Each structure stands twice: as C-alpha cells, then as structure tokens.
Design an enzyme around this catalytic site. Structure first.
Site, PDB file in Angstrom:
ATOM      1  N   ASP A  12       0.820  -1.199   0.000  1.00 34.21           N
ATOM      2  CA  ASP A  12       0.000   0.000   0.000  1.00 34.21           C
ATOM      3  C   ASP A  12       0.863   1.263   0.000  1.00 34.21           C
ATOM      4  O   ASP A  12       1.883   1.295  -0.675  1.00 34.21           O
ATOM      5  CB  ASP A  12      -0.938  -0.030   1.207  1.00 34.21           C
ATOM      6  CG  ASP A  12      -2.237   0.694   0.942  1.00 34.21           C
ATOM      7  OD1 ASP A  12      -2.241   1.943   0.987  1.00 34.21           O
ATOM      8  OD2 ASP A  12      -3.255   0.018   0.681  1.00 34.21           O
ATOM      9  N   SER A  39     -11.574  -1.106   0.433  1.00 37.90           N
ATOM     10  CA  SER A  39     -10.255  -1.115   1.069  1.00 37.90           C
ATOM     11  C   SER A  39     -10.220  -1.843   2.403  1.00 37.90           C
ATOM     12  O   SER A  39      -9.204  -2.439   2.740  1.00 37.90           O
ATOM     13  CB  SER A  39      -9.755   0.311   1.295  1.00 37.90           C
ATOM     14  OG  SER A  39      -9.265   0.871   0.092  1.00 37.90           O
ATOM     15  N   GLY A  83     -12.999  -4.033  -5.427  1.00 35.79           N
ATOM     16  CA  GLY A  83     -13.134  -2.768  -6.141  1.00 35.79           C
ATOM     17  C   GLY A  83     -14.193  -1.824  -5.599  1.00 35.79           C
ATOM     18  O   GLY A  83     -15.041  -2.225  -4.807  1.00 35.79           O
ATOM     19  N   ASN A  84     -14.149  -0.561  -6.020  1.00 42.42           N
ATOM     20  CA  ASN A  84     -15.103   0.413  -5.502  1.00 42.42           C
ATOM     21  C   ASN A  84     -15.869   1.153  -6.590  1.00 42.42           C
ATOM     22  O   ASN A  84     -16.285   2.290  -6.388  1.00 42.42           O
ATOM     23  CB  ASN A  84     -14.394   1.429  -4.600  1.00 42.42           C
ATOM     24  CG  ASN A  84     -13.232   2.132  -5.295  1.00 42.42           C
ATOM     25  OD1 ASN A  84     -13.054   2.027  -6.517  1.00 42.42           O
ATOM     26  ND2 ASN A  84     -12.428   2.849  -4.512  1.00 42.42           N
ATOM     27  N   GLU A 140       4.959  -3.106  -9.004  1.00 41.65           N
ATOM     28  CA  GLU A 140       4.035  -4.138  -8.544  1.00 41.65           C
ATOM     29  C   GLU A 140       4.748  -5.463  -8.361  1.00 41.65           C
ATOM     30  O   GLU A 140       4.533  -6.157  -7.376  1.00 41.65           O
ATOM     31  CB  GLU A 140       2.877  -4.319  -9.535  1.00 41.65           C
ATOM     32  CG  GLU A 140       1.994  -3.090  -9.707  1.00 41.65           C
ATOM     33  CD  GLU A 140       0.954  -3.282 -10.806  1.00 41.65           C
ATOM     34  OE1 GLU A 140       0.798  -4.433 -11.294  1.00 41.65           O
ATOM     35  OE2 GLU A 140       0.308  -2.282 -11.190  1.00 41.65           O
ATOM     36  N   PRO A 150      -6.361  -0.945 -10.523  1.00 43.63           N
ATOM     37  CA  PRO A 150      -6.782   0.008 -11.555  1.00 43.63           C
ATOM     38  C   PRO A 150      -7.949   0.831 -11.044  1.00 43.63           C
ATOM     39  O   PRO A 150      -8.726   0.340 -10.224  1.00 43.63           O
ATOM     40  CB  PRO A 150      -7.222  -0.886 -12.729  1.00 43.63           C
ATOM     41  CG  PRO A 150      -6.650  -2.246 -12.430  1.00 43.63           C
ATOM     42  CD  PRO A 150      -6.622  -2.337 -10.922  1.00 43.63           C
ATOM     43  N   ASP A 201     -19.202  -0.554 -12.501  1.00 43.39           N
ATOM     44  CA  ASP A 201     -18.074  -1.335 -12.997  1.00 43.39           C
ATOM     45  C   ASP A 201     -18.286  -2.829 -12.731  1.00 43.39           C
ATOM     46  O   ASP A 201     -19.116  -3.210 -11.904  1.00 43.39           O
ATOM     47  CB  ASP A 201     -16.764  -0.863 -12.351  1.00 43.39           C
ATOM     48  CG  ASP A 201     -15.570  -0.990 -13.289  1.00 43.39           C
ATOM     49  OD1 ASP A 201     -15.591  -1.851 -14.205  1.00 43.39           O
ATOM     50  OD2 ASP A 201     -14.607  -0.213 -13.113  1.00 43.39           O
ATOM     51  N   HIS A 260      -3.505   5.267   4.328  1.00 39.08           N
ATOM     52  CA  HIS A 260      -4.308   4.134   3.861  1.00 39.08           C
ATOM     53  C   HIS A 260      -3.750   2.782   4.301  1.00 39.08           C
ATOM     54  O   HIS A 260      -4.484   1.932   4.828  1.00 39.08           O
ATOM     55  CB  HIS A 260      -4.422   4.204   2.335  1.00 39.08           C
ATOM     56  CG  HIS A 260      -5.436   3.275   1.747  1.00 39.08           C
ATOM     57  ND1 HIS A 260      -5.083   2.111   1.098  1.00 39.08           N
ATOM     58  CD2 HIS A 260      -6.785   3.358   1.667  1.00 39.08           C
ATOM     59  CE1 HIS A 260      -6.173   1.508   0.657  1.00 39.08           C
ATOM     60  NE2 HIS A 260      -7.218   2.242   0.990  1.00 39.08           N
ATOM     61  N   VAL A 299      -4.879   0.387  23.935  1.00 30.53           N
ATOM     62  CA  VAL A 299      -4.851   1.275  22.775  1.00 30.53           C
ATOM     63  C   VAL A 299      -5.805   0.810  21.661  1.00 30.53           C
ATOM     64  O   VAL A 299      -5.773  -0.358  21.244  1.00 30.53           O
ATOM     65  CB  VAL A 299      -3.419   1.383  22.184  1.00 30.53           C
ATOM     66  CG1 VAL A 299      -3.433   2.199  20.895  1.00 30.53           C
ATOM     67  CG2 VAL A 299      -2.445   1.996  23.194  1.00 30.53           C
ATOM     68  N   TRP A 319      -5.876  -2.038  -3.433  1.00 28.59           N
ATOM     69  CA  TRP A 319      -5.568  -1.102  -4.511  1.00 28.59           C
ATOM     70  C   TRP A 319      -5.725  -1.797  -5.851  1.00 28.59           C
ATOM     71  O   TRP A 319      -5.869  -3.016  -5.908  1.00 28.59           O
ATOM     72  CB  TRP A 319      -4.145  -0.549  -4.368  1.00 28.59           C
ATOM     73  CG  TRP A 319      -3.056  -1.603  -4.325  1.00 28.59           C
ATOM     74  CD1 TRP A 319      -2.505  -2.172  -3.202  1.00 28.59           C
ATOM     75  CD2 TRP A 319      -2.390  -2.207  -5.448  1.00 28.59           C
ATOM     76  NE1 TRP A 319      -1.542  -3.086  -3.563  1.00 28.59           N
ATOM     77  CE2 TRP A 319      -1.452  -3.125  -4.934  1.00 28.59           C
ATOM     78  CE3 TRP A 319      -2.492  -2.051  -6.838  1.00 28.59           C
ATOM     79  CZ2 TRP A 319      -0.626  -3.899  -5.759  1.00 28.59           C
ATOM     80  CZ3 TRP A 319      -1.663  -2.809  -7.660  1.00 28.59           C
ATOM     81  CH2 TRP A 319      -0.741  -3.721  -7.115  1.00 28.59           C
TER      82      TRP A 319
HETATM   83 CA    CA Z   1      -4.961  -2.469  20.728  1.00 28.80          CA
END
Ligand code: CA
Ligand code: CL
Ligand code: NA
Ligand code: NA
Ligand code: NA
Ligand code: NA
Ligand code: NA
Ligand code: NA
Length: 473
Positions: free
Chosen positions: A45, A260, A186-187, A128, A148, A193, A86, A102, A146
């Site tokens: 990424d 993602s 994909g998004n 890639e 195209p 698409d 990201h 945390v 990630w």
């Molecule tokens: Ca934690």
C-alpha cells in the site's frame, strides 16, 4: 477459558464478534487458540506507520520494504492532507495489538505485520512485481487494497512482470505451498463497474473479497462479478457502523471504509487459518473459503444455488467469511491433488454477435488424459471479440450443471471500440462441479443501438482435479 480483548475500542468492533450473528465469527477462532502467532502478513500500500502504538509490537521489518524510494523503511510520507494513511489503516485491521489499552484489535492480533510502500509514486509493472515478489519465503500473506481505477470503462490488469510475480508466488512461494494473495474487489459500484474487467481480482491466483454493510446489504461502492470468492463486512450508509483501526500519526479511527477495509479483514482470517494448519497450499485456502463461507442474512437479488448445492452471488461470492469455521476445517484438511488444466478451443469459425449470440458446446473435459477434470475449481472463458461499443455487451456462461455465471454486465460508461483481446473472464461459481457436458456462452447487446461485432476466439479453460469430492450441500 478465553478472555476477549480489553482494548478501549474493541466493543466498537461489531464485525469481529457479537450476539447478533452479524459478524465474521472471529472470537470463536480466538477461543480455539488461534490468534495469528507465527504468521506473517504484508500490506502492499502507501506505507505502514511502523512505530504506531498499536502496530509496533507486531511490526516485522522482514515483511516490509519501500519500493517507491528503494530502501527498507516503509514509513509513510507525512503530508498535511494525510494522503498516506491508507496502508496504516489496513495494517491495523489485520494485526493491531490486543490488550494494550490502545484503540482496538487486529483479526490476527498476534501475527507479524509488515508493509510495502509502493502506491506513493508512479506504480509501474516493475513496482508491482517487486512488491508482490517481496521476501516470498518469509511473508505468508499479501494484502492489496488497490488496483486500476474503477471508472467503469477500462479493461486493465497485471502486465508481464506482475503476472510473473503471481506465478512465481503461488509456485515457489511459502516453501512451494504458494503465496496467498488477498485482493479488494473494487469500488466502482456507482460507475457500474464489473470486477471481471480487473485482471487483479479476476486472477485465479488472488482471493478477491467483496463487502457487505452492517445491516447485510450490498454497499453503494460494491462491484458485482463472477470472479469474487467471498465477503467481509465494511462500511455502508451513515446509520451503519464502520471499521475500527490504527490511523496515521499514532491515532485511532472508527471510520475506515470501502472495499479497502474488506481485504485486510480477509487477510487476518486467512492468517488465523494458516496458524491452524501451516501446510495449506494456496489452492487449499480457496477451497476452505468456498466450503465455509456463509450467505445467510446477506441481501442480494441474484443468489443462486450451484451444481453442488452451494449458494453463490455475484455481489458476495460464497458469502461472509467465517473465521471459526475456517480454523476448524483447516486442522484436519487433506491437501488437494495437483492442479490440472484442461484447455478447450470452442469455435470452428468466427461468429457474428449482432443482437444476441449463443454458443453451445458439449465437452469431455480432457477425458482419458492426465488433465481430466471431474472436480472444477476456477473456470475461464478466454474471449477474443470485436464490437463497436463495448459497454453495451453482457456476457453469460452456463455450466453443464446449470450454473449461470455473469462474466460481464453492461457498463454504461464503457464506450470502447477495442473489444476484448483474449480476456480471461473468470468464474468461481461452478467450484466443485463436474465440468463434463454442455457449456453455453451468451453474448448480448443490452441496448437498442444497432451494434455490430464478431467473436473470433472462445477458449474454455478449466482448472481442477479428478478426486476427493464431498457429498453436495
Ligand atoms: Ca490495541
Ligand atoms: Cl496456467
Ligand atoms: Na522509506
Ligand atoms: Na493494461
Ligand atoms: Na509449488
Ligand atoms: Na481472484
Ligand atoms: Na456433465
Ligand atoms: Na443442456
């Protein structure tokens, strides 16, 4: 007995566990003793904040590299817009540390986590390939949120070096067992698409993962296609909860979203699964996903039962991943037989598409030969055709067992006159079916336009085995 994590935001991680049954059943895997110990996952990424309070304990430099700057340190490039947050968000989904006061926890909160900084710059074929091929005898699982751009009009996929990286990975990676490549499908939902037009997700070497909203619906960004294998929860509308994870600048976010976020959750579940059986091959892993994934309560208008009784959707594949079921089935899993490949050239002459074209062909699936297949895994229709407006086409493939796969739905933004050049449309929907018999390919013009073109090649490529079948569902 098992005590769940006490992290401050764990109660907000609705997708990991709950009474509701609207989850990925991850706590059940934890309770069986699987938390990812010994497994290595790399996030490909825009970098990983290796010093983040919830990642540092699990960070693995051996699983990391900076391909953009060509050095070992994958630290994100800090900017005012926080562009490079990201990968850190994705990494925390997999392997955020548990019980440390945390944020929340990773799916595999005792796994080792690395990152490859490779999106923050020009992403070439070579970039890639160097990322996919990173330390393949150390890294077990690669996660890629990630690809195209999903603008609903192009056809794109791995070029030569990246494709070579996939074959080297599944063949020689992980001691010959094969690298596990997890991909976000994909998004491009809003652009209408199809994820079969994306060579990364359409690949048999990647486990392509789609998304469902909290209330069990198909999210706005979601892409439908036959190459998708399964689904994990992610974001939806503003009444639905989102994903909790590590953010840039040592922060915590409760608003990680989109396709993602789905791939990393899958990669985490696959890490728990590899802990339960380190000897699983890349194909074993896809078999486990097919057998254990759960349609129930996912809403779609296209759920169909395939030839071996499994429900499958183009929005969801075989449904939600089920971590408890994955680790249970993994422990005594018998390795599948070597992969066979039966190549069948269907056409004797080119065929005009016109308004509608139907190609029927009865096949023996390499009967009498070493690549005889009675148990299908992936099937491809490798198509070469010309057409005046590509996005008007819809293409379906029907198996001998009657399973109708949508290879290509209409793409209104695709005005290309370039057609398809040996594009290998892939379906997972006929997994474990006997591929002997009549296959049907349907190509139709979904518009009222007077369109024209010619199908000049149809190679049916079958992958699978000739042994080990289960009684259908
Ligand atoms: Ca934690
Ligand atoms: Cl091959
Ligand atoms: Na660096
Ligand atoms: Na391309
Ligand atoms: Na091998
Ligand atoms: Na794939
Ligand atoms: Na048959
Ligand atoms: Na028939």
């Amino acid at each position: 007995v098992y005590q769940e994590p006490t992290d401050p935001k764990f109660p907000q991680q609705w997708y990991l566990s709950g009474v509701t049954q609207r989850d990925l059943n991850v706590k059940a895997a934890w309770a069986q003793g699987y938390t990812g110990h010994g497994i290595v996952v790399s996030i490909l990424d825009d970098g990983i904040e290796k010093n983040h309070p919830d990642l540092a304990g699990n960070y693995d430099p051996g699983a990391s590299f900076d391909v953009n700057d060509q050095d070992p340190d994958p630290q994100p490039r800090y900017t005012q817009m926080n562009d490079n947050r990201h990968g850190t968000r994705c990494a925390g989904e997999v392997a955020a540390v548990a019980n440390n006061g945390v944020c929340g926890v990773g799916v595999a909160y005792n796994a080792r986590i690395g990152g490859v900084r490779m999106l923050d710059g020009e992403v070439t074929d070579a970039v890639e390939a160097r990322s996919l091929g990173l330390n393949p005898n150390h890294i077990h699982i690669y996660s890629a949120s990630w690809g195209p751009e999903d603008d609903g009009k192009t056809v794109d996929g791995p070029a030569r070096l990246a494709e070579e990286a996939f074959f080297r990975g599944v063949s020689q990676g992980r001691g010959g067992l094969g690298s596990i490549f997890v991909w976000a499908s994909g998004n491009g939902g809003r652009e209408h698409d199809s994820c079969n037009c994306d060579g990364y997700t359409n690949s048999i070497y990647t486990l392509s993962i789609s998304s469902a909203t909290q209330f069990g619906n198909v999210p706005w960004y979601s892409e439908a296609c036959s190459s998708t294998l399964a689904t994990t929860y992610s974001s939806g509308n503003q009444n639905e909860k989102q994903i909790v994870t590590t953010d840039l600048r040592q922060k915590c976010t409760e608003s990680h979203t989109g396709t993602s976020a789905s791939a990393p959750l899958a990669a985490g579940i696959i890490a728990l699964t590899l802990e339960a059986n380190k000897n699983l091959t890349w194909r074993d892993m896809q078999h486990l996903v097919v057998q254990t994934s759960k349609p129930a309560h996912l809403n779609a208008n296209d759920w169909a039962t395939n030839g071996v009784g499994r429900k499958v959707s183009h929005s969801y594949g075989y449904g939600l991943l089920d971590a408890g079921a994955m680790v249970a089935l993994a422990q005594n899993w018998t390795t599948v037989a070597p992969q066979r490949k039966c190549i069948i050239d269907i056409l004797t002459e080119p065929k005009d598409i016109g308004k509608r074209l139907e190609v029927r062909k009865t096949v023996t699936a390499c009967l009498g030969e070493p690549n005889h297949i009675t148990r299908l895994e992936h099937a491809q229709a490798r198509l070469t055709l010309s057409y005046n407006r590509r996005g008007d086409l819809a293409i379906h493939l029907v198996s001998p067992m009657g399973t109708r796969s949508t290879l290509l739905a209409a793409r209104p933004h695709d005005y290309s006159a370039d057609g398809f050049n040996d594009w290998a449309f892939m379906t997972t929907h006929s997994w474990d079916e006997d591929p002997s018999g009549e296959w049907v390919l349907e190509i139709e013009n979904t518009s009222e336009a007077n369109n024209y073109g010619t199908l000049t090649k149809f190679t049916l490529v079958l992958y699978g085995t000739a042994s080990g079948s289960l009684v259908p569902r």
